[PDB]
């Protein structure tokens, strides 16, 4: 839709210029060696190299000088949604599966509430690292139908 990358646009350069300009104008109110002034210059070069990094990864860039994600599915601009999306999905599946497995395990006790408030940190530690199995394991579960239930609703 006409969004040029700010490796080439101008308003991005204007934003960068104004930001570093106000920062520099603020910088000249101390000693050129004072640790606060040093950190100020540090943040200056930091935001500068940020602008540089943004001007390195195909970031299509708005008509007002701002990045703008492209989540349309085209893997050309995928370093914004697709790969971080699947990464977070992996993490979330990790957490969900480990929690579910812990609960299913600890269900078999006298009053599982006492272990739901005060976790079996030993069992918790020997159950927790199983995350690397969450895609495949649950998979087999659904294959064997051991993931859901049919007509057991209350009680257990």
């Amino acid at each position: 839709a006409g969004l040029t990358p700010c490796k080439e646009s101008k308003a991005f350069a204007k934003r960068e210029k104004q930001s570093v300009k106000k920062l520099n104008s603020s910088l000249k109110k101390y000693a050129p060696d004072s640790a606060p002034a040093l950190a100020i210059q540090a943040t200056i070069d930091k935001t500068k190299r940020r602008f540089e990094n943004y001007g390195k990864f195909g970031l299509l860039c708005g008509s007002d000088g701002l990045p703008h994600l492209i989540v349309s599915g085209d893997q050309r601009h995928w370093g914004e949604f697709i790969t971080p999306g699947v990464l977070f999905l992996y993490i979330a599946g990790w957490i969900g599966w480990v929690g579910r497995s812990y609960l299913i395990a600890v269900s078999g006790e006298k009053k599982p509430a006492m272990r739901e408030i005060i976790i079996d940190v030993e069992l918790a530690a020997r159950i927790i690292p199983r995350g690397f199995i969450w895609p495949v394991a649950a998979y087999r579960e659904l294959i064997n139908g051991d993931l859901v239930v049919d007509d057991a609703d209350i009680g257990y």
Binding site: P129, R130, F132, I133, V136, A137, R140
Partner: protein
């Protein structure tokens, strides 16, 4: 058998019947027998093709750097120009593999079902052992004994490891791994993962 931890007790999952048992499951994945079978077959196929791949990486590189031959790098062979364009050979690969692998899977689901070549009725197949197919695969009449399956699986595991090493070292470097070996032999201390970061 050789529990890779001289103090830990092996879980009941890996008794020792299957080749290459060492109780190496600190995460209790295959504690279900059918999934254990699944991962047995998966390890078999991954190891075989990893051996294939690591050979196809290493041997061409050294034979080229030896001056006897001339062939591009395994990564530098894609853009090379052959008698056939990429897509052609790729779709032929796709159809042939969608035949062979689906037959393999049908054998996996059903022991001893898809045995015969369904074209001609003789010449077909002697009944096999799952993961270790029959005649037309072992022409030299090798006896499928122990110390053969164990050697196979060990070589294949190390091959998997070496292939992942090839891939990640090409990622960080993009160079020929044998050149990395030469630089290594120059000075193992001055040539390692540390300096290249």
């Amino acid at each position: 058998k050789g529990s890779w931890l001289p103090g830990l007790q092996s879980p009941a999952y890996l008794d020792g019947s299957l080749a290459g048992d060492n109780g190496f499951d600190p995460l209790a994945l295959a504690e279900d027998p059918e999934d254990l079978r699944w991962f047995v077959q998966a390890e078999l196929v991954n190891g075989r093709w990893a051996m294939l791949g690591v050979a196809g990486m290493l041997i061409p590189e050294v034979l080229t750097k030896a001056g006897l031959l001339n062939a591009p790098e395994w990564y530098d062979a894609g853009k090379e120009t052959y008698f056939a364009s990429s897509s052609t050979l790729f779709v032929i690969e796709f159809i042939l593999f969608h035949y062979v692998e689906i037959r393999r899977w049908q054998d996996i689901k059903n022991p001893g079902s898809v045995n015969q070549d369904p074209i001609f009725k003789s010449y077909s197949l002697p009944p096999h052992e799952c993961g270790y197919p029959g005649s037309v695969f072992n022409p030299l009449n090798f006896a499928p004994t122990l110390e053969n399956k164990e050697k196979e699986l060990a070589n294949g595991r190390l091959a998997m490891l070496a292939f992942l090493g090839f891939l990640v070292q090409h990622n960080v470097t993009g160079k020929g791994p044998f050149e990395n070996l030469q630089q290594h032999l120059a000075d193992p201390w001055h040539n390692t993962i540390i300096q290249t970061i």
